[PDB]
A = this chain, B = another copy of it.
């Protein structure tokens, strides 16, 4: 059994050939839209400080001016080609966009004295690159203001690389963000940080080679930035009312809060002076995720449809061009009004259809199996295809939002862990060889979906079974070859690769500077996650923390291996009281500055039992950024 990337099976090739026949030949419409306003193309590379590649559009040349290969869904191939169109774009005079230099776009508005930006891209490196491409064709001006459209890393991530933290803290640079920005940005990207960043590798397929038999696109972007720096700079002005009008450097900004739709902290930006609506990631030219593969809170499709309709009503009649923080604009009022109506209907359908079927007694997987397509004319639009969000996943996500993972059947009340279930199922099926025979029967039949279910049990029962791994990877690859969903392709390709070759050595948060924006409260919330309860039991203690810089008191309590904190108060009977600054704390937990060294230097001043502070830091776990996904967890010692 081979570990090599197999060609498309006859079944796969035939399946893709049939997709070619049934695609809307409306063609060039989105190509003309993606090309319109192109000032300077980009096909090059973005490198980091150490000369490592961060971004590379050149890797995708195989897509340009060529027809779809048998190993890639033709509809997916079309989207991939559109996403190859990168560079600096002029929407209108004074209104620019840098697209395809990062997963997200950067909107640049030319003000009276400087520049007003909508989003800062994913990394410092890509943010800098995007701004440099802009400065190659437009005069050098300072950044006067920044808008964070939502709490997603691809929008706030590159902030520090282009703006100064001190200028934001001073109010010199206005940084706008929707209600609940930090809370949600830190929960998603920091608190559940390690899990998300790793799961995200499957979503983007970053470590998978670029080619017709591997990584081709990610639906709303190509892939993610490698070997780069994620940053976080807290906003200065928060959008709290449903609508807020603010003018900065002679630029009229009209914010529409869209909380709990695409992101927990989210908003649209209307530009009155331009007759342009920036729909952030609320209406991209593909079905978005109600539940993201990387892992984040469920999204509300009802609210999402409501917010879209609100934009269509409030701005639809005064918008000449719709711009987004992913992909190309939509030109002309007529087209924008149709687009928004179509977008709204898609989210409303996802919600209402699932609730209709839920109330009929259908469970998550029954619902996903019964709704095969978008209704009426929605199935005929290019901008509504499941390139990013999957119809099945989104239907399952509505079920999750309203009811949860549990289907109501008590036989599913207490599922076994994958290894325990794997061993039992393999035995029940006649042992390893019997499952391998059935896997081969399924692959021959072209039932790749069943073969992956079969193989997963075997791989989890015995990760040392090489035939099981090769067959599992072969079936996933064929599934990836067939899928129109870019994210599903990426997940399947990553899975295939990791089954065959193991997990590649890469950490998305390696160079991450997001921990700087963290308040002491946020910081202790992370320590509460890091704390090893098993080790911490029998070590009840109270630690008081006084931040001389922030004039903030935190009462930390460790009880029964559980860490809780109180902001603004101090415990009178605290085992220890720690006097320091936020920077000093950062260094100690990041293992940059040693504890007795800080006491020696006088940066840390203790009152009471200092041993207790040392033992507290000894109870904290350190999360490895690598973890097995397609096979069981790498243990550690012998079992």
Q: How many copies does the complex hold?
A: 2
A495 partner residues in chain B, CB cutoff 8 A: 409-411
Is A25's beta carbon under 8 Å from chain B?
no
Among residues of B, the one whose C-beta sits closest to the C-beta of A494 is B410
Please state if B193 and A359 are interface contacts (CB–CB under 8 Å).
yes
Is A115 positioned at the interface, with any CB of B under 8 Å from its CB?
A: no
- In the complex, the answer to whether B408 meets A341 with C-beta atoms within 8 Å is no
Q: Which of A334-382 contact B (CB under 8 A)?
A: 341, 344-345, 348-349, 352-353, 355-356, 358-366, 368-370, 374-378
Q: With an 8 A cutoff between CB atoms, is A429 at the interface?
A: yes
Q: Is the beta-carbon distance between A361 and B633 smaller than 8 angstroms? A: yes
Cα separation A533 to B354 with both chains bound (whole Å):
11
Count of A interface residues, CB-CB < 8 Å = 121
**In the assembled complex, which residues on chain B have CB atoms less than 8 Å from the CB atom of A534?**
375
A438 in contact (CB, < 8 A): yes
Contacts A529-B355, A533-B349 known; A408 to B563 CB distance under 8 Å? no
**Across-interface contacts of A374 in B (CB, < 8 A):** 560
**Contact A409 B630, beta carbon cutoff 8 Å:** yes
Contact present for A375 and B561 (CB under 8 Å): yes
A538 CB–B CB distance under 8 Å? yes
Nearest residue, chain B, Cβ from A525: B302
Within 8 A of B (CB), among A613-639: 621, 623-624, 627-630, 633
Let me know if A192 and B413 touch, CB within 8 A: no
**A418 interface residue, CB < 8 Å from B?**
yes
Binds B, one of A94-102, A132-140, A220-228, A399-407: A399-407
A396 partner, pick from B405, B410, B418, B533, beta carbons under 8 A? B405
Q: Are A562 and B416 in contact (CB under 8 A)?
A: no
A506 in contact (CB, < 8 A): no
Q: Give the chain B neighbours of A538 by CB distance below 8 A.
A: 376
Task: Decide: A358 near B430, CB < 8 A? Known: A295-B404, A396-B405, A404-B298.
Answer: no
Q: Does A47 contact B (CB under 8 A)?
A: no
A350 to chain B, nearest CB (A): 10
Asked if A273 is an interface residue, CB under 8 A from chain B, the answer is: no
| Chain B residues whose C-beta falls within 8 Å of the C-beta of A559 in the assembled complex | 341, 345, 376
Interface residues of A in 457-495 (CB under 8 A from B): 472, 476, 479, 488, 491-492, 494-495
Task: Known A356-B621, A561-B376; judge A406-B364 contact (CB<8 A).
Answer: no
Does B366 lie within 8 Å of A418, measured CB to CB? yes
> Smallest CB–CB gap between A122 and chain B, Å?
20
Closest to A529 in B: B355
Query: Is A420 part of the binding interface, using a Cβ–Cβ cutoff of 8 Å?
Result: yes
Is the CB–CB distance between B562 and A195 below 8 Å? Answer: no
| Complex interface: chain B residues within 8 A of A393 (CB) | 406, 413
Which listed residue (B415, B430, B628) contacts A361, Cβ 8 A?
A: B628
Say if the beta carbon of A152 comes within 8 Å of chain B.
Answer: no
Contact residues of A between 227 and 286, Cβ < 8 Å to B: none
* Chain B residue at smallest Cβ distance from A452: B411
Min CB gap A35→B, angstroms: 30
Name the B residues within 8 Å of A10 (CB-CB): none
Check A449–B348 contact: CB distance below 8 A. Answer: no
A549 beta carbon closer than 8 Å to chain B: no
Q: A293 at the A/B interface (Cβ < 8 Å)? A: yes
- A-B contact sample (20 more), CB < 8 A, given A194-B358, A359-B529: A191-B402, A195-B403, A291-B404, A295-B403, A298-B404, A345-B560, A348-B563, A349-B533, A353-B533, A366-B419, A397-B404, A400-B400, A400-B404, A408-B629, A409-B629, A410-B476, A411-B472, A411-B630, A415-B453, A428-B429
A-B pairs, 8 with minimum CB distance: A361-B627, A376-B560, A295-B403, A411-B456, A194-B359, A369-B417, A410-B495, A405-B405
Q: List 9 A-B contacts (CB under 8 A).
A: A195-B402, A202-B410, A348-B528, A353-B533, A361-B633, A365-B415, A370-B417, A374-B560, A411-B476
